[PDB]
Amino acid sequence: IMQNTDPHSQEYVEHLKDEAQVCAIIERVQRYLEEKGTTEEICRVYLRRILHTYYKFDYKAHQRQLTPPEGSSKSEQDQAENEGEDSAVLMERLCKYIYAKDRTDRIRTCAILCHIYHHALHSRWYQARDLMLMSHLQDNIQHADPPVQILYNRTMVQLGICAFRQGLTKDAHNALLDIQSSGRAKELLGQGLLLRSLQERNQEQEKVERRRQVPFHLHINLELLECVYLVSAMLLEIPYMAAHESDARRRMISKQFHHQLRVGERQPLLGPPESMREHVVAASKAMKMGDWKTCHSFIINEKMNGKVWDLFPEADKVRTMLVRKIQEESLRTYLFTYSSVYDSISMETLSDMFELDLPTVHSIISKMIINEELMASLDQPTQTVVMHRTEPTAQQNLALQLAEKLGSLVENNERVFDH
Amino acid sequence: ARLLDMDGIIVEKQRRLATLLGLQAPPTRIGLINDMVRFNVLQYVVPEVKDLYNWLEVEFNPLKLCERVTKVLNWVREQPEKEPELQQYVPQLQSNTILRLLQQVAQIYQSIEFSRLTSLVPFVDAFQLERAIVDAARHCDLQVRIDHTSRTLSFGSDLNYATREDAPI
Amino acid sequence: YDLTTRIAHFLDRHLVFPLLEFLSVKEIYNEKELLQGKLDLLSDTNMVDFAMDVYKNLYSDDIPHALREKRTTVVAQLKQLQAETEPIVKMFEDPETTRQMQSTRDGRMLFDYLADKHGFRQEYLDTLYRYAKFQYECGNYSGAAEYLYFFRVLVPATDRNALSSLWGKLASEILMQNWDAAMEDLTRLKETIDNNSVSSPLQSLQQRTWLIHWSLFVFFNHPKGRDNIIDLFLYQPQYLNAIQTMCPHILRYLTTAVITNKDVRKRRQVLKDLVKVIQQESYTYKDPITEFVECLYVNFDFDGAQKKLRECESVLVNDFFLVACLEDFIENARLFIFETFCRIHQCISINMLADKLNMTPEEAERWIVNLIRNARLDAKIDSKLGHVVMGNNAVSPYQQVIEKTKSLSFRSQMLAMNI
């Protein structure tokens, strides 16, 4: 069914309702179990049931917790609801042994990928991060058949998502990097044409994917996935390149968000952004200039366009996570250029201006001058910096010093080859 | 983008745009205005505005300019019979007049207290404008030590002489 | 980690001998008393550390476990109950058993002498069988267990016996306060687990816990033990993957072992690979002291840092736990942060410093002058104010490359110039 009915629109709803009803059925087929009694094979009812529990939502992992738990009914039924949210992550603990018991890699690598899903969304991303790092299913997917390849890709999405939802640029980068090196998420979700560049032959074989994959209600937006990746990297790389073009350059890395920004950067003709790419480029330029203001443009407007914002109840959180990072890294991009110009700084100004507070701006500027290896002297009780780090001619001098220094270093390879 | 990558692949396109517009090279600035005012342009110009550039281009004097221009600003910023087209071009051109003023006073003064500096310049807010100066300063149009412990500004006689002060090109 | 795919199945089903129980309802600071209730079970009944609690804050809840030990001395437990004015009428079974033990002993004691006398293997191994039997019945019989394992530790079924016996000995000898004999097992028990059996987690992780045990107390130079244990099962703050295990003072005592006896170079290795890892993410949610000790430090807070650091030292001096380095931590907890705070600094007041840590400014002065004597900072005192000044902005890094970039090429062109 949930394949041949199509799609944005509507026969659709009585069919969703049959879906409700089959939910019913599978529920039913569960409590009954005389099986041979209880435990020891039923587990597959349980399997079906967790396949119809697994891809459900923040709102139904937090109808137990944020439909108010002292505002909700105290009736055995409400506990059966609060236990109903437990009952799938229960059958993990239970029915491992009822499988627990089969070692078959193709069901092991399948099951655990669905389990790591539950964690990051319903609960801790910690437990999600733990579970895959324990399992080491990078080796095991080789032993697994090509549906579970799709699950491996699919699970990696939702972890780079809940990286960005917990607010960690780094982990969201590395997670969503592996997908965005490629343009195969298309064919992995069973959507690919034979020609959509030139590559994707042959006819009778891509139909296998159409037959095996996939209901529409399990999908995610790829512009989401794109933007979430390109924004994670943004906060890492714009200070990085601000540092680089203040002549810290030797760390300039291709085939990264650097490239993905570059292709959009080199438009002669961009005015207002009307694509999600262009909204990323738009906020990127604002970040370079170091105005907070330009971040807010794409974070509000393109997220309404685009409904990158409107798919999370945690967009409320992730707003604050985005905002203060922008305000800190924009301050940092500003400082990477401006610090030649300074003689000193009212650190109080920076707090007021970038909308931050002194305890944090202390810790920021403290971390900065330690680890970015600046020639600032930092009076933290007086809230003053005294810097005086020269020279504008240095931009040429250090550059020819490098051009010089590069001479001898390659030259020693030309020696060591020769001999 | 240019200052980053090297480097265009981003100039011949501008030349092409110029051609399109009918030009062969790249337009220039209030230079442009000299251009299209070699004609009888000091005249037809309606005198809502006739005596606003008689400040900006013609009249001196840094420590009065933002004062002087406040009234022809308030005049033109009533938009509906004067082409609403104009009055979205006005806020940038107001900042451009400030930008003009900010460049001069690095040669008029060698230092100035920020409290004096506030009174020199009629504007909406100081908290806004300082950041727009620090922006211009960061984009190397002038050199200032506007941020500083006392909250006072130092333009400096030379210190280290560079084209950062001069606005470089 | 790679063992953790296997620990994932087991789900915390470890094999402690008192089974779960320690002292009940307790009143004092709790992350302290955490580790006591932990190691009560993991050490096979502690003893002294029944009473180690009861000193500061009285309980009668040490009495239940004070019924239940026989290998420390049977009758020592038979008194502590009587002291709490308890009728205990039917103590007729330990007088029965441990009497008839002596009737059994007069055989083995006779056979034992005659065999080591002759130097005759068979008479000694049949004794070793009779005697390794005997010593776990009651190990008081204190020196007898040491005598038993002096000549031969290789019993009929070597490792399984040897493990539980050397562990029963490492346990009982620490309880007897015979720390020379316990130091004998410090050689031998750790070697036995490094000669691992199956290497199932229930074995391995318990054995890994038993390494934390001999290092706990402190006889001689257990900081050598630190350097040895950290290079075993490598670089984990518990050694036990899966985050169930919580041991606060393994890291506090490691922090003491690093700083008080060695350089701190050498502590930012720790700050990465023991203060940030998967196990320790769990831990950072929990323990107040060890959190303040590092999180405040690495963020380069000074205000909340050196205050809440100084606050830790109130909870430190409440420690009646076996440590014997308790005050050199109190010392270094002020030293270590100060160096790092002042590292990039302009001008700190000796007076502000002395207000904080509750010393006189003279003390703080000679302290600072001794931190500069030790050359942990290059600084100089503004004596008139009583402020201390770091001010290196160290401009002109050009010349660093210039000497060697030609002195390399000059002498390296000599190569190709030769032939």
Burial (Cβ within 10 Å: 0-12, 13-18, ≥19) of residue C341: buried
Integer Cα distance of B1 and B11 in angstroms? 12
* A130 touches C: beta carbon within 8 Å: yes
Report CB contact under 8 Å: B135, A289. Answer: yes
Q: Nearest C-alpha of chain B: how many angstroms from A332?
A: 13
- 8 Å CB contact between C77 and C98: no
Question: What chains are in contact with B, requiring at least 3 Cβ pairs below 8 Å?
Answer: A
Structural determination approach: cryo-EM
| Contact residues, A window 322-381, toward C, CB-based 8 Å cutoff | 359, 362-363, 366-367, 369-370, 375-381
CB atoms within 10 A of CB A331: 22
Place of tokens 């099962």: C233
Interacting residues of C179 by C-beta distance below 8 A, sequence separation 6+: C173, C217, C219
| Contact residues, B window 7-36, toward A, CB-based 8 Å cutoff | 8-10, 13-14, 17
Q: What angle do CA A307, A313, A317 make, to 5 degrees?
A: 100
* A285 touches C: beta carbon within 8 Å: no
Integer Cα distance of C164 and C185 in angstroms? 12
Residues of C in contact with A407 (CB under 8 A): 405, 409
Report CB contact under 8 Å: A241, B9. Answer: no
Query: Can you state the angle between helices A358-371 and C303-316, rounded to 10 degrees?
Result: 90
Pairing of strands A377-379, C347-349: unpaired
- 8 Å CB contact between C185 and C170: yes
Q: Do chains C and B touch (3 or more CB pairs under 8 A)?
A: no
Alpha carbon separation from A196 to A186, A199, A200, A317 (Å, rounded):
10, 8, 7, 38
Alpha carbon separation from A225 to A7, A229, A277, A296, C217 (Å, rounded):
21, 6, 12, 19, 53
Structure tokens of C230? 């950290």
Question: What chains are in contact with A, requiring at least 3 Cβ pairs below 8 Å?
Answer: B, C
CA distance between the termini of chain B: 18
* B160 touches A: beta carbon within 8 Å: yes
- 8 Å CB contact between A277 and A234: no
Burial (Cβ within 10 Å: 0-12, 13-18, ≥19) of residue A134: buried
Among A93, A379, A412, select the one facing C345 at the smallest CB separation.
Answer: A379
Place of tokens 């006392």: B150
Integer Cα distance of C31 and C306 in angstroms? 21
Helical H segments across A251-357, by residue range: 257-265, 276-289, 293-297, 303-304, 315-338, 347-353
Report CB contact under 8 Å: B149, A353. Answer: no
Interacting residues of C158 by C-beta distance below 8 A, sequence separation 6+: none
Q: Nearest C-alpha of chain C: how many angstroms from A390?
A: 7
Q: Do chains A and B touch (3 or more CB pairs under 8 A)?
A: yes
What is the Cβ-side half-sphere exposure of residue B98, based on CA atoms within 13 angstroms? 25
- 8 Å CB contact between A335 and A354: no
What residues does A47 pair with on adjacent strands? none
Among A385, A389, A411, select the one facing C409 at the smallest CB separation.
Answer: A411
Q: Nearest C-alpha of chain A: how many angstroms from C9?
A: 8
Dihedral angle over CA of B38, B40, B44, B45, nearest 10: 10
- The beta-strand segments (E) located in chain B are 111-113, 152-154
| Contact residues, A window 171-230, toward C, CB-based 8 Å cutoff | none
Residues of C in contact with A362 (CB under 8 A): 301-303
Place of tokens 């994670």: A232
Place of tokens 């011949």: B12
Of C96, C118, C142, nearest to C127 (Cα)?
Answer: C118
- Chain C residue with the nearest C-alpha to that of A129: C278
Order of all β-strands in the sheet with C380-382:
C347-349, C387-389, C380-382
Report CB contact under 8 Å: A415, C412. Answer: yes
Contacts across the A-C interface (CB distance below 8 Å): 107
Residue type present at position B155: F
- Chain C residue with the nearest C-alpha to that of A358: C301
